[PDB]
Amino acid sequence: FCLTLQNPLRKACISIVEWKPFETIILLTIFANCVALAVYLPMPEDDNNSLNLGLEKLEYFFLTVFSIEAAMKIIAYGFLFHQDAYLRSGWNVLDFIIVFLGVFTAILVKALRAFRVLRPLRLVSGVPSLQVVLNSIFKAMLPLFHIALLVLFMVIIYAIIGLELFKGKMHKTCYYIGTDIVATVENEKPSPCARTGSGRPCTINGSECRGGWPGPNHGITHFDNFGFSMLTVYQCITMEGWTDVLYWVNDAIGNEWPWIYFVTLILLGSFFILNLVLGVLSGEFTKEREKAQQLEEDLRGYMSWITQCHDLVKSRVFYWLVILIVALNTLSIASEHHNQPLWLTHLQDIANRVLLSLFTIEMLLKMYGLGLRQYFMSIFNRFDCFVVCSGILELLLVESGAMTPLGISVLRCIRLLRLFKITKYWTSLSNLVASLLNSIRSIASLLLLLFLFIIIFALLGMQLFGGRYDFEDTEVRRSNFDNFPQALISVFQVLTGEDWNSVMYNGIMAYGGPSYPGVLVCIYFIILFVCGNYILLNVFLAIAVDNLAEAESATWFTNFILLFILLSSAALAAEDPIRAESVRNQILGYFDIAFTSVFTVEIVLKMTTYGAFLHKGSFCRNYFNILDLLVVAVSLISMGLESSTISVVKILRVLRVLRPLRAINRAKGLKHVVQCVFVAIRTIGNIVLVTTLLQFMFACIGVQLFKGKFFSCNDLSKMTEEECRGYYYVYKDGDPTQMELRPRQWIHNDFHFDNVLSAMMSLFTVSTFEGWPQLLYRAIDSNEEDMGPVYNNRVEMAIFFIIYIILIAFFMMNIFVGFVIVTFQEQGETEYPKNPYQYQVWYVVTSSYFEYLMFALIMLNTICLGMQHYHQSEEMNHISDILNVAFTIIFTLEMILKLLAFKARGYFGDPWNVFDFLIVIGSIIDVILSEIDTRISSAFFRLFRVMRLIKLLSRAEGVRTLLWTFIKSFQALPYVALLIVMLFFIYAVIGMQMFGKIALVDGTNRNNNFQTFPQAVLLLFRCATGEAWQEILLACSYGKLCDPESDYAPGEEYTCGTNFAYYYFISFYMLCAFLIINLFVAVIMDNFDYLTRDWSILGXXXXXXXXXXXXXXXXXXXXXXXXXXXXXXXXXXXXXX
C-alpha cells in the first residue's frame, strides 16, 4: 500500500539500501549493543556507576543510527512494510527506543532501562532461518492448547479447592501462638506451620518467641487471596519444594488427608505433563508418518588399495598375525592406565602415594604407543599422517612422552584425557555414536536460540532483580544477579527447575515484600521456565526427529493332582487368604501377634509353587529351564528361600508376598510392555555405557582438580582445615547482641571428591538435578588444599558443573526418546416425547437458550468464589452466604425444570445430569448446614459447591473428549501400577525396620518421620519426585539414637542406631526410574498409540464430527423413504460442512 511516497533522492538512497554493506553494519552494531549492555549490567546497585557511565551516550549513538535506518524505512514500503513480522518487531523496538530517550531528555524511570533490554531480539531479526525456526516453534504451541487450559483448569480447580480447605487453613497459616523451647504441639489446637531453619523460633516476641508464619517469611504461598493460592499451586505443580507446603499445612491440623490433595495434584500434574510429552511426540509422529557416502568410501579405500632396512618395516606395514595378538596384549596396557587414572589420582589430601612408581609404567605405555605410531609412520610415511586420527593418537603418545613440565598440573591431568584412547575399541558402537553426534549439527541452531533466550532473559534479569539486588540480612543469598556471570549461572539454575523457589523468594522479597506492584515481579519466573522448560521441551522434538531418522535408517497321580483345576481353585482361595494375611502383615505391629498361621499359609503356597517347579522339571525342563525365565524363576524361588538367616542377611517373611506374584504372569497385557522393555534395554545399552564412562571421565577430572578442596571450615574465617579448632560464634539474624557459641569446624562437605567412588557418588547427585547448586557454590569457594573462601573466588570453576550438566541434557534426553521409537515400532507391531403443558416447557428448555444463561450463572458463581479474601472482618461473608443461596436455588430450580421432562429419563439418560442431581443434593444439604450453624465437615460439603465448576467442563466439547480418550486409556496400564505400588510395598516394608528407629529430630525426620508404614510410603514417595532425597540419604548413613523412646539397644546411644545403607536409596531411585519408564511406555501404548492418531484425525478428518452427525440423526426415526425425505434437509445441510 505504501504512503506519501516520493521520487528524487529517495529512490537513490533506497537503491543504496538495496545493496549489501548496510546489513553487516547494522548487525555488527547490534553486536555492539549486546556487548555494551552485557557490560552495562556490571554493575548496578542503584547509583554509583563506573565505566558504563560513558556508554550512556553510546546507546543514543545506536539510537540515532537505527533511527537513520528508520529514515531509510521511510523509503521502504510504509503500510506495505508493516506486513513483515521481523520488520514489525523492528519498528516496534524503534518506537521503544524513540519513546525511551525521548522521555529521557525530559528527565534532565528505570522502566525505560528495562525497555533497553528489548534490543537483542534484533539479532534474530537480521538472521535468516531463525525466522524459520521460530515459525516452527509457533506451530508447536497449537496442538497443546487444550491441555494447557486443563493445567490452568486444575490450576483453577485446585485453587478454588485450595480456596476452601486451604483457605480454611488460610485461617491457620496466617497466625500462631507459642512459647519456650520450640516444642509447641503440632496439629492439636493452638498449632502452626513453622519456618524451615536449622532451629526455628521466630522472635516476635509473642511470649517466648512466636511460632508460625509462612505468607512472607516463607514468602508468598499463603492461600488467603486467590492469587497467592494460584502461586503456591504453580510451585506445587513444579514438583519443587511443594512437600514443604505439605509439612507446613500438616504441622497445623492436620494429618487427615492433605495428602489426598497433594497426591492427586502431583499425580495429575504428572499425568498431563506426560501428556504434554505425548503431544510433542505426536507432532514427531505427525511429521514422520509421511517423512518415512559409499562412493567416497570406495574412493578412499581403493586409493589405499593402489597405494599398497626400512623395507622390512614396509613388510611390517601388513605383517603379521602377531599384530592381532598384540591387540589382546594392548588390552593390558590401557588396563594399567585404567587403574592408574585412579591410582595416580587416589587417594587425596596427599594420602597414600599410590603412584610410587606408576610414572615409569606411564612412560612405558607411552613408549609402546610411540613404538606403534613410529612403526605406523614406517608403514606408509606421510600417508599414515594423512589420517587425522593417527597423528592425533601419535601426538597424544608424544604428549605422554613429554615431561613433568610445567606449573600447570592440569597438563598432568590431561593424562586422564589420554585414557580416552582406550575407548578406541567397542566395534560398531562408535558408528552409532557418530549417528548420535550427527544430530547435534541439526539441533545446534535451536540450541543457539536457547542460548539467545538465555542471554536476553539473563540481561533483563540482571537489570531487574539484580537491578536492585540488595537485600540486607543475612546470607547466603546465593546467586542474585550481582554480576553478569552470576545471572548466567542463576538463569541456568531456575532453568533446571532446581530450587528456583528460593531465588523467587529473594525476588519478591527484593521489592519490599508482597503488595501490588512487587508481586507482579513473580510473573517473570512464570514467563520464564514455563516457557523456558517449554523451549527445552521443544528441544525434544528436534532429537525426536533426528533419532527417528536413525530409526528410519505312581507319579502320574501326583501329576493329576498338581495339574488339577480344583487344586488351582484351592490355590485361589489360598491366594485370597495369603493375600489377606500379607495385607494383615503390612502393618509393622502384626508380627507382635499370632502371624504364624499366615506363615503356614505362605509355606503352603511356596510348597505348591515349588511342587509346580517339580512338575515342570520332569517334562523336558532343566536345560530348557536354564533357558526359560519361568522354570528358572521357580527354581530360584526354591533356592533363594532356602538361604539361611545366619551368614549374609535374609528375611523369609518378606518373601511371602512373592508367591502370588506369579499369577501376574497370567495377565498378558503386562507381557507386551515388558517384552518392549527387555527389547529396550538391549536397544540402548551402549549409551548407558557411554554415560557411565562419562561418570569416569568427569570423575578423573574432578579428583585431580578438587581433591584437596571442600574440607570446609566454619565459616571462611579459619581457612586452613587444621588451623580449625575450638569454639566459634554464631550471631542469630544479624544483630551483634545475640551470640551463640559453637564447637564448630571442620566440615567434610558431605561429598568429597577424595575418591573416584565418591565421585560416582556426588556426580550422581548432580545427575539427579537435585541439590547441586549448593555443591556448585561451595565448589566455587575452592582454593588450593585446606581452604575455602570466598564470595566469588575462582569463578572459572563454575564452568565445569554446567558443562557436565549439558551432556546430561543430551544422552538422558536421548534415552527417553529411544524407548519411544521402539514403541512406535511396537505400535506398528500393535498395528499388525412431550405432551400437554409439559410439551410446552420441554420446548422452552430444550431450545437451550438457557444453556448460555446457565453457563453465565456458573461463571458468575465462579467469580463469587473468587470472593474469598480472608483479611478482616465480616460483612461480605453474609453476602457470600446470600450468593451461595442464590446459585443453589437457581440450580436446584433448573434441575426441577429438567425434572419436568423425561423424568424417567431426565433423572438419568445422559449421565452428567445425574451428577448435577448430586450437586443439587450436596448443595442443599450444605445450605441447611449453614442454617444449623446458628460443623467441620461442612467444609468438605462446600467442596461440593466448588465442584460445580466441573459443569463448565461439561460444556467444554472437543476438550472433555480428550479426557475421554484419557479414560479409555486409563484402564489397561493400571496393572503396572500394582507393581508401582509393589515396588514401594516391598521396599517400604523392607526399609520399615531397617531404616526404622532413626529418631525424630529436625534433619532432612520429624514431621517427615520414617516411623509408621504410611509415612514411609511418603518418604519413599518424595524420592519418586526428586525432592531433596540426598539429604535424607545423608541422614541415614549413621543417623541418630533409636526412636529415642524405643528399645534402643542398651547403654549404647550416641546416634549409633543407624548405619550405612546407601544401596537402598540409590537402587531405589533407579528402580523407580525404570518403573516410571514403564509408566511412560504404558501410558503411551494405551493412549497416544491411538490418541496421537486421534489428534491426526481430529486435526484433519471428521471421525469426531461424525458422532455429531449421528446426534443429528437422533432427530429422526428408522426409515423409510419418508425418513430420508424429512432428513434430506439436515443431510443437504450437513454435507456442506
Partner: protein, 138 residues
C-alpha cells in the same frame, strides 16, 4: 437392564440394608459413649441422613417395582437416585459422626462400640452407594 445389574446389586443391597440396620442401631443405642448444641445439630444431620436413607429405600423398592413393570432407564433412574440419596445420607452420617467425635473432645468418658459400628456402617454405605452409582453408568 442386565441380569448382572440384578445379580451384582443383589450383593450390594445386602451391605446396604446391613449398614442401614447398623445405622438404626447406631442412633438407637444408649451406649453411644461410656460416661465415667452441636451435638443436637449433628443429631439433626443424622435425622436428615436417615430421612434421605429411607427415601432412598423407597426409591429402591420403587426401582424394583418399576423394573418389574417398565423399561429400565426409568427403574435405573430410580436406583441411581437411591444410591445417591443413600450416599449423601451416608456422608451426612459421617458428618454427624465426626461432629460427635469433636464434641466428645469438647468434654471421664470412653469411646463406645456403637460409634465405630456407625463408622463402618457409613463406610459400607459409602463404598456400596459408590458402586451402585457406578453401576448406573457401565
Amino acid at each position: 437392564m442386565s441380569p448382572t445389574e440384578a445379580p451384582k446389586v443383589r450383593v450390594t443391597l445386602f451391605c446396604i440394608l446391613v449398614g442401614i440396620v447398623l445405622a438404626m442401631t447406631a442412633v438407637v443405642s444408649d451406649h453411644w459413649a461410656v460416661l465415667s448444641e452441636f451435638t443436637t445439630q449433628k443429631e439433626y444431620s443424622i435425622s436428615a441422613a436417615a430421612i434421605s436413607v429411607f427415601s432412598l429405600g423407597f426409591l429402591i423398592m420403587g426401582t424394583i417395582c418399576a423394573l418389574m413393570a417398565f423399561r429400565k432407564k426409568r427403574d435405573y433412574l430410580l436406583r441411581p437416585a437411591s444410591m445417591f440419596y443413600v450416599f449423601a445420607g451416608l456422608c451426612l452420617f459421617v458428618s454427624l459422626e465426626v461432629m460427635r467425635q469433636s464434641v466428645k473432645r469438647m468434654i471421664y468418658y470412653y469411646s463406645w462400640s456403637f460409634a465405630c459400628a456407625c463408622a463402618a456402617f457409613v463406610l459400607l454405605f459409602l463404598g456400596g452407594i459408590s458402586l451402585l452409582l457406578f453401576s448406573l453408568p457401565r
